[PDB]
């Protein structure tokens with residue numbers, strides 16, 4: 179149920195995603211994470227950006243308190259947001275998360291996104307023309323600060339998210355590198371299966387972690403409502419009928435059998451319990467091939483508002 183990372187730690191291959199649109203009350207993140215743990219999830223993914231780490235920490239700690247799990251049974255991910263890329267601000271950011279969580283460490287700390295924005299409480303700072311106030315930071319300097327967090331034991335493992343191949347290489351080949359990223363958390367699903375980035379990551383011992391595995395939240399305005407609905411896919415639904423599972427479970431199983439760690443968000447009890455069933459069955463080679471055919475090379479999450487700066491990751495082929 180776990181993959182071994184390049185720093186020797188272990189990551190459960192199924193993970194619970196906690197992000198939800200703003201309209202959703204924070205109390206739901208607490209209830210949802212509790213249900214997820216009760217249903218079998220041991221890998222919990224969140225972020226400072228999501229503004230729920232207080233709720234997600236409470237859910238984790240309450241499931242420790244009622245004796246369901248030990249801390250060591252739980253793999254919790256946080257992420258450093260773009261308003262704290264500056265080296266001197268990395269640790270205060272992790273420490274703030276730990277304070278909100280009331281946890282002693284995170285199992286995994288990621289650089290959330292490679293484009294930096296102006297330091298401050300605002301997570302998307304803008305000027306009067308509604309333009310983003312970008313910052314200028316050497317992400318290599320950021321990584322060194324992130325490395326010290328592992329030295330200090332605040333994060334057991336460290337990694338990145340939304341990095342392209344060249345940005346991975348920038349870190350990987352950096353003079354005096356202490357720790358490789360253990361993972362690259364990126365968008366991955368049958369419509370955008372990241373084969374080249376996946377091959378690159380494997381070659382360097384980096385785990386690929388798939389977010390928006392089910393076709394994403396589809397939150398407006400962030401995502402075009404005209405974009406294909408992954409869970410309504412002909413092939414996934416046919417595989418679903420054939421295996422007496424669901425399209426969601428097919429999409430999740432696909433990532434597992436191709437060596438990808440896979441995230442899945444849900445605030446619904448039934449689907450939360452459904453999603454852990456990913457372990458109950460397997461696809462054949464021929465089905466895996468057929469899912470491979472689904473690739474459309476189109477992202478649900480482009481973050482156009484962050485395009486412009488030299489670190490915008492999605493302009494390279496991969």
Ligand SMILES: NC(=O)c1ccc[n+]([C@@H]2O[C@H](COP(=O)([O-])OP(=O)(O)OC[C@H]3O[C@@H](n4cnc5c(N)ncnc54)[C@H](OP(=O)(O)O)[C@@H]3O)[C@@H](O)[C@H]2O)c1
Nearest residue numbers: 195196197389390391392393394395426443444445446449
């Ligand atoms: N840049 C980043 O690092 C980044 C970006 C995006 C996401 N993420 C992470 O990845 C997580 C998940 O990605 P995501 O939120 O974009 O979406 P997702 O996991 O691909 O899908 C979420 C949507 O699918 C629905 N759903 C869940 N299980 C289902 C099932 N069994 N059958 C049918 N529908 C189902 C959910 O509805 P219900 O809640 O009603 O069940 C929700 O609307 C996030 O929470 C976050 O942790 C990270």
Ligand SMILES: CCCc1n[nH]c2c1[C@@H](c1cc(OC)c(O)c([N+](=O)[O-])c1)C(C#N)=C(N)O2
Nearest residue numbers: 197225290291302395397400401478479480481
């Ligand atoms: C910079 C904009 C931040 C932001 N605030 N609210 C958002 C975002 C976008 C986002 C960015 C993420 O990492 C960069 C991320 O981790 C996740 N996630 O977890 O779903 C979502 C987004 C999209 N698409 C949607 N629908 O809502």
